[PDB]
Design a protein around this ligand. Structure first.
Ligand code: CA
Length: 536
């Protein structure tokens, strides 16, 4: 059999910034329903929306306090059932972020164990200790220890791998494993078509009695003790198999952020009955907020390694930018021409494109003043360093605004009405919006970024670019170039990464996507440009 997701094309929405439909300045699900026409015109066949479960919003809703309802700002279960009905009527699927490693301190289960030390929900989380002592030196990704002495408070301590308020689930206890399955099945019965299984690599944690020998004696971020353990695969296996059995058209898409490529195999290999695909973070490359310079050859090695090592097994995921990173323009594009060229570069390879909302319009990071807006701690102390450097106030803010995750959640600019018709009230975030793009301007203008992605996406649907093999061409270190072939038919994508015009040796030759080039047999590309050439 073949399933809908084999020929998938995914549009990621951070729904707080997509469309506000009740004038609170916060985007909602009814907003997204209003803009289904826009999505069809772009040609995306699936929407992955960010978490929308009831949640304290301590960490963009991945700190979940109730999987069975729906955050009040976003709307009502009625709205969500209708969104998944409307999208299905437009031939569009939907997939949700579902986090398997932790809940919030607010989840009923944790609230039972924090208040009853004799509760059976103490086993649903990870508790150990003597007299507010940490039983080992493991350190969280968010700072200090993974341990937090319980409020209950017996002089034990509960495990959190991230923030103190996001306690980890004990996957050893099979009562959690069924429960998480029940959450997944619940949503699949609603008719959501897949699920982004988040932080799943961390369900496995070592023998708690062990320490990691370190710098000493500060608690240490010991990935080996709580990432990619054999337990991960054995606990996921029945979880995945059960989902598949009952909902076989369901996409199970993993987050293996910075996992081994050999691990991406383990998680995606059909033999192991786990995941269909995996997002990886390994594609890419005062201290810490200085504008990023992509190590361009390193990108080429990883892009090839991944396309190659996964050729026989699984589709790679194809993405540029995100809700947790600076947008494409800003972070890496130098021009409208390169923005187009890069999208081409990445997405016409073998895989499933995941394109971030607003990337298609060629949006940039918002750019703004005041630490508060950032919802981040390190920005204040970091700006002080550059100021000492004597980089202007203006310039210091810019640098951080051009590198930080949060400026990449700008509201969609849809039109020329107030707040670009995103809302009517104060939008939940706003700043400079440097510089002004709107969907009205780009849906008409066939020169625009949008029209390029539209045409680019219709090409991607073709049997050549969906199912064909991939082979990266011998390297202009200047330029990214590769070939896609069905065996019967064949085409070459070629993209300039130089600001000076450059030349390419290749066979012969029909064009479809492209932005200014030469025709002889040898090929010359205008600066940062690129073209798709079908052979004979
Ligand atoms: Ca709203």
């Amino acid at each position: 059999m073949s399933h809908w997701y084999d020929h998938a094309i995914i549009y990621q929405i951070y729904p707080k910034s997509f469309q506000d439909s009740n004038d609170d300045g916060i985007g909602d699900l009814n907003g997204i329903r209003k803009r289904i026409p826009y999505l069809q015109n772009l040609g995306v066949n699936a929407v992955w929306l960010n978490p929308v479960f009831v949640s304290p919003q301590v960490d963009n809703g991945y700190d979940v306090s109730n999987y069975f309802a729906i955050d009040s700002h976003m709307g009502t279960m009625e709205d969500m059932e209708n969104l998944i009905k409307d999208l299905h009527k437009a031939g569009i699927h939907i997939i949700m972020d579902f986090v398997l490693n932790h809940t919030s301190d607010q989840h009923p289960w944790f609230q039972d164990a924090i208040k009853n030390p004799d509760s059976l929900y103490r086993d649903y989380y990870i508790f150990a200790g003597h007299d507010n002592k940490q039983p080992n030196n493991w350190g969280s990704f968010f700072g200090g220890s993974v341990w937090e002495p319980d409020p209950a408070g017996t002089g034990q301590s509960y495990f959190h791998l991230f923030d103190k308020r996001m306690p980890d689930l004990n996957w050893k206890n099979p009562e959690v494993r069924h429960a998480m399955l029940e959450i997944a099945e619940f949503w699949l019965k609603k008719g959501i078509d897949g699920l982004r299984l988040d932080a799943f690599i961390h369900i496995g944690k070592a023998d708690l009695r062990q320490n990691y020998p370190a710098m000493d004696d500060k608690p240490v971020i010991a990935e080996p003790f709580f990432a990619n353990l054999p337990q991960v695969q054995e606990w996921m296996r029945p979880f995945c198999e059960q989902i598949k059995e009952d909902y076989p058209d369901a996409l199970l898409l993993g987050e293996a952020a910075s996992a081994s490529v050999n691990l991406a195999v383990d998680y995606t290999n059909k033999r192991n009955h786990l995941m269909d695909c995996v997002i990886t973070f390994r594609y890419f490359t005062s201290a810490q907020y200085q504008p990023k310079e992509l190590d361009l050859t390193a990108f080429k090695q990883n892009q090839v390694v991944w396309q190659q090592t996964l050729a026989d097994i699984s589709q790679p995921t194809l993405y540029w930018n995100n809700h947790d990173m600076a947008r494409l323009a800003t972070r890496i594009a130098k021009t409208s021409t390169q923005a187009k060229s890069l999208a081409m570069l990445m997405y016409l390879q073998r895989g499933i494109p995941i394109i971030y909302y607003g990337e298609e319009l060629g949006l940039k990071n918002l750019h703004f003043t005041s630490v508060d807006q950032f919802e981040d701690q390190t920005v204040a102390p970091w700006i002080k360093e550059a100021q000492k450097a004597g980089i202007s106030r203006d310039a210091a803010f810019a640098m951080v605004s051009d590198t930080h995750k949060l400026p990449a959640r700008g509201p969609m600019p849809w039109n020329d009405t107030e707040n670009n018709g995103f809302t009517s009230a104060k939008p939940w975030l706003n700043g400079i919006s440097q510089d002004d793009v709107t969907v009205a301007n780009e849906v008409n203008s066939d020169n625009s970024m949008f029209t390029f992605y539209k045409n680019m996406l219709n090409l991607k649907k073709e049997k050549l670019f969906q199912d064909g093999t991939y082979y990266m061409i011998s390297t202009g270190k200047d330029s990214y170039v590769y070939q896609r072939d069905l065996g019967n038919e064949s085409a070459i994508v070629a993209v300039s990464l130089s600001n000076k015009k450059i030349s390419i040796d290749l066979p012969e030759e029909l064009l479809k996507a492209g932005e200014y080039q030469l025709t002889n047999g040898k090929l010359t590309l205008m600066p940062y440009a690129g073209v798709v050439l079908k052979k004979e």
